[PDB]
Amino acid sequence: DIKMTQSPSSMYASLGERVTITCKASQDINSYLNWFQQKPGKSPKTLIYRTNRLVDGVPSRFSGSGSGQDYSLTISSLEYEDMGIYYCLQYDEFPYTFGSGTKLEIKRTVAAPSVFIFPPSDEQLKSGTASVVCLLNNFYPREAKVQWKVDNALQSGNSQESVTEQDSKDSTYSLSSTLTLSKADYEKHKVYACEVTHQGLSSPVTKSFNR
Amino acid sequence: DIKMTQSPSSMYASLGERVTITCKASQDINSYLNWFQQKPGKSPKTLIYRTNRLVDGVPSRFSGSGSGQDYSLTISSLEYEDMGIYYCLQYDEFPYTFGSGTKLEIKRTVAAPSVFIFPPSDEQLKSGTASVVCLLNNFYPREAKVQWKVDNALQSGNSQESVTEQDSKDSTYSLSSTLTLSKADYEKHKVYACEVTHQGLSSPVTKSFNR
Amino acid sequence: QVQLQQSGAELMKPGASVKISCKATGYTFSSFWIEWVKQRPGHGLEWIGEILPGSGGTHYNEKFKGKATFTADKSSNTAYMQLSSLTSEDSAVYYCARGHSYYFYDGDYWGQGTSVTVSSASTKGPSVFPLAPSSKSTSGGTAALGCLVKDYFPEPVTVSWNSGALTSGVHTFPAVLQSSGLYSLSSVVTVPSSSLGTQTYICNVNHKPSNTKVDKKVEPK
Amino acid sequence: QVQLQQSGAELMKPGASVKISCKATGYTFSSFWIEWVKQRPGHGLEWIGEILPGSGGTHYNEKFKGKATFTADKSSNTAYMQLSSLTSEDSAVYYCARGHSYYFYDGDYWGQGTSVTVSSASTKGPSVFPLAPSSKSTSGGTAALGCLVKDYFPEPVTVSWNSGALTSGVHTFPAVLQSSGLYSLSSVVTVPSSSLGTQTYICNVNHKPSNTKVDKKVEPK
Q1: Which of A178, B58, B157, D122 pairs as cysteine with A15 (C-beta 3.0–4.6 A)?
Q2: Residue of D nearest to B101 (CA)
Q3: Per its UniProt entry, which superkingdom is the organism in (chains A, B) (predicted)?
Q4: Are B184 and C141 a contacting pair at CB < 8 A?
Q5: CB contact (8 A) between residue A138 and residue C47
């Protein structure tokens, strides 16, 4: 029934900034609302119940404000531990409903990536295929780029990238791109390049080996 | 019910000055008012009951004045022993209510801080993490500043400061800032700086080890 | 000690059914409602409904009424949820949370989540290969090593380094759906080049749906 | 003279209850009202209500009525307060004060205060490390040494130097709530650089909620 709106869907602030999210109902949900926080790879966690009461174990910078059909969650000072998706829920009526969820990211200084390349493992080769991994570690922003090039022939639809959420230790990202080919087609070619362009690199860094 | 107002919230005087606090009711609380004093880390202590009667064991410079809905507490001569939070309470009606409380701090001559730095302890390292402490001892005023810098890269959301109340011995403050990182990330870097700016330092003093 | 151990992640066939357990702990089981929320890959949260184990009464979210059916065993303080007539739409992560008693409520306490995939395919343990720290010393400083968890299914796989010990500076990327239909993911760690030849590490990849449990070794370059 | 020994500081679970004792001394217990005030971390004072042990009559602050419930045992001159159905809001320091008698009100005498934390957590003793006086001789004069009381819970921890002996020029900072959820705090001491290599000191950290009792040693560089 009740539509619980959350916006914006993405929200960024720097560590220390005072950030604040909001949620809109569709009727006096009478402050019967909670706020959830789901850090990546983890089940949610209740932060505030009944609009403003903080579940215990939850820091004080978190405050519950709102009423009627308008509610919001503010974070006095932002520490790395608050990156994640925040959801609101109304238990004023069945069925209980969740907001779309506002993701919360941290803004910081740029940082170029350290590019590592790993050649096909022994076992994997003692098997059928062979895949090369390239690591772009602790960089910022994630809005970065990677391109595969065996023998100076830019790959296409044969790789696969994956990114992590901000590693709280420094709010940086990390990306890994995997180039996968058979043991046979892996032997035909000699070099395996991993070009990395990023606003932190005054120029495309290329990591690669010969095999 | 009754709103007991106290203002200002902060109050400073020098040792010897005659200081005086006030409290406003919301109706003839008929002089049924008390004054409490809570020194830091200590439970309150009753000083004056029924507007002017001094609880025994309490010095004479303390005097109870006021009536109707206006009351105040004066301290003829201020000795270091009176720094703390003072509260007023009305037992003229249920429920009994407290004023917000005025903090009372001793005003003194400026004094730059002595900056000490402590490198990660042996045990703590023989464990998972490592944290560096920096001490800003016996200084005034507390309204001072500290910034962390490993390898000339000003930290952010990785430290934590804490201040003490005025150490009666000289009415000075003391602050400690802890920079915390893992044993691993602690090894990557080489230097750990603690810059301290304070109106008592004609220039930012920096304490740090190259460990 | 309020806990909520949910059954393990599983795979099932379309048209079939699946039953998720929720072992509640540290509280009077029948006093609080047990709730279930659904979360499909990258899509937020959905409230499924609830049940009061004490009375056995239930409030289903009409969208799920008939689809999900709750049950609970007071004997063992275990709540269940049977998702039947499985179809693509049911592939999601399901949680059971400790709602409230009509006597007091201090928030929802959540279970870890139970992964569920609807599919004609067979489960398949992964093959983990080592990504040893090689010549990554060239104009560098620190060393990077990690494990490659290749071709497995279904979607719930976990990795740990040095058995939870030296798990600091670890990056475990989310899985990527490869052509074969299997999943793969990589797990790497940043460490002191110096300590590369003395101290050794191992990744602990666990893929429950197939009872796999690899504890592999990373051969330095 | 009058006294008011309150029970020790404690930890309890949400939804549970907690009973604080107040042993009154040096006066006719049933003649004076016993009062309870609450004080949440950095937030002033709240009047909870009172009870006259003689008649057993009580005046609750409606905001606390139902939440706090007073009782008193004339046999032993002990007043109690039961904070039930605990939740985050109840984490605070509670005091019992000797109110007034409806005869003569010679003020309010206070107990030391009883710390109370509501948490589905487990108590956890601290790990104290030494902060030895190192090269802090550079353009200095005196020496600073202290102990670091790292990661512990709940909030009531005490430190002493040289067992109350040489405790002059000591600074024990208030605890800071770290990311882990544990508390940590530091305790330092200013001393004569000269006497740094002869006379030695030890901090005595006590964390009752876990029955910890560390008496650690600090040694320079």
Answers
A1: B157
A2: D44
A3: Eukaryota
A4: no
A5: no
Q: Write out chain A residues lying below 8 Å of B181, CB-based.
A: 169
Contacts of A164 in chain C (CB under 8 A): 171-174
Domain shared by C79 and C39, yes or no: yes
Contact present, B21 and B6 (Cβ < 8 Å): yes
Closest-CA residue of D relative to A79 is: D179
Q: How many CB atoms are located within 10 Å of the residue A182 CB?
A: 12
Secondary structure string (H, E, C) spanning C136-200: CCCCCCCEEEEEEEEEEECCCCEEEEHHHCCCCCEEECCCEECCCCCEEEEEEEEECHHHCCCCC
- Resolution limit, Å: 2.8
DSSP string of chain D, one letter each residue? --EEEEPPPEEE-TT--EEEEEEEESS-GGGEEEEEEEE-TTS--EEEEEEETTTTEEEE-TTTBTTEEEEEETTTTEEEEEE-S--GGG-EEEEEEEEEESS-----EE---EEEEE-SS--B--EEEEE---STTTT--SEEEEEEEEEEBSS-EEEEEGGGTT-SSEEEPPPEE-TTS-EEEEEEEEE-GGGSSSS--EEEEEEGGGTEEEEEE----
Same domain for C115 and C69: yes
* Contact flag D47-B89 (C-beta cutoff 8 Å): yes
What residue spans in chain B does CATH classification 2.60.40.10 cover? 1-108, 109-211
| Domain ranges, residue C98 | 1-120
- Short-list D150, A6, D18, A59, CA closest to B128: D150
Tokens 């200590």 sit on residue:
B42
Q: Collect all residues of chain B within an 8 Å Cβ-Cβ radius of residue D150.
A: 124, 131
Domain B109-211 CATH assignment equals 3.30.379.10: no
Distance CA C101, CA C28 (A): 10
d(CA C84, CA C66): 8
Which residue in chain A has the smallest CA separation from B186?
A169
Other Cβ atoms less than 10 A from the Cβ of B126: the count is: 9
Residue C204: strand pairing partners: C160, C215
In CATH terms, the fold of domain B1-108 is Immunoglobulin-like (2.60.40)
From C85, C120, C155, the end of a domain falls on C120
C168–B188 CB contact, under 8 Å:
no
Partners of A176 on chain C (C-beta within 8 Å) are 171, 173, 186, 188
- Contact at CB, C1 and D120, closer than 8 angstroms: yes
Q: Find chains touching chain B: ≥3 CB pairs under 8 Å.
A: A, C, D
Is B156 in contact with A16 (Cβ distance < 8 A)?
A: yes
Residues in chain A with CB shorter than 8 Å from the CB of C20 are none
